[PDB]
């Protein structure tokens, strides 16, 4: 039988539409996954021309940063105590900067404040070929074979053509591309304790055999870091869900802007992944947290409710 949950599908499409209209956007997409099995619970596109979750590739922006941070932790290139100099810099003429100047951040801060500088410095501790293989094993550039026509493979440029500035910008999500379904898939490596799942349109009695990408301890620490994104001081507080700890990342691509919000809950033992992108918002903000956060919040909270997941902390 199909994995789609019609209750979540309806909830996803309605909230997506509210957001796209309210922000006077061109389009929008939602993916909802079972965080433990990878089955696809919901897939919503508006307007309903094509399956943009599968056909349209986007630059993930900051939504890629957790994987770089996870890889740096996993390989022992950093730890939870290091404070990195996160002053903006240039490589040749090209700047690498954050929205604010943070003189130093630890890894939690790099996640919480979404530091392009900190993430690029962690990525630079790896060679281009290593980082290329890592992005490829996350599935970037690898077709999903979903069976929808026009399905995209995404874009992963051959590592031999990378300039050093390009490795840096890929680490915070520019210069590589993937569909929203590919991005949601990558997040199963974080929610399923380091094991990337293949995804499925059929119900899974047990989590299928995946592929380990991170140690379990790495994945668990990274999930805890991502909760700071939705707590005060983080960039994605608009995606907080009452009664739950939500690990998330928010991002803004450039096209004009594409606002993205992706997250999972309960963060400690995830049940659901919700990924929202809003194409070309023109009203009431353009950042991922402001535009895609609110629909994420509604779709996640409703999905947890529909699925009978009780809150882990008192409601406020």
UniProtKB/Swiss-Prot annotation:
Per the record, its GO cellular-component terms are: plasma membrane
Q: What results from changing residue 294 to L?
A: In strain: CDC84-060384
User: In which pathway does this enzyme or protein participate?
Assistant: Cell wall biogenesis; peptidoglycan biosynthesis
GO MF assignments: penicillin binding; peptidoglycan glycosyltransferase activity; serine-type D-Ala-D-Ala carboxypeptidase activity
Entry EC no(s): 3.4.16.4
| Effect recorded for residue 284 to N | In strain: FA19 and CDC84-060418
Q: Coiled-coil segments, which residues?
A: none
Q: Which domain of life is it from?
A: Bacteria
What does the function comment of this entry state? Catalyzes cross-linking of the peptidoglycan cell wall at the division septum.
What other facts are recorded?
A: This protein was sequenced in penicillin-sensitive strains LM306, and FA19, and in penicillin-resistant strains CDC84-060384, CDC84-060418 and CDC77-124615. The sequence shown is that of strain LM306.
* Domain-related comment: The enzyme has an N-terminal penicillin insensitive transglycosylase domain (formation of linear glycan strands) and a C-terminal penicillin-sensitive transpeptidase domain (cross-linking of the peptide subunits).
Q: What is the protein named?
A: Probable peptidoglycan D,D-transpeptidase PenA
Tell me what gene encodes this: penA
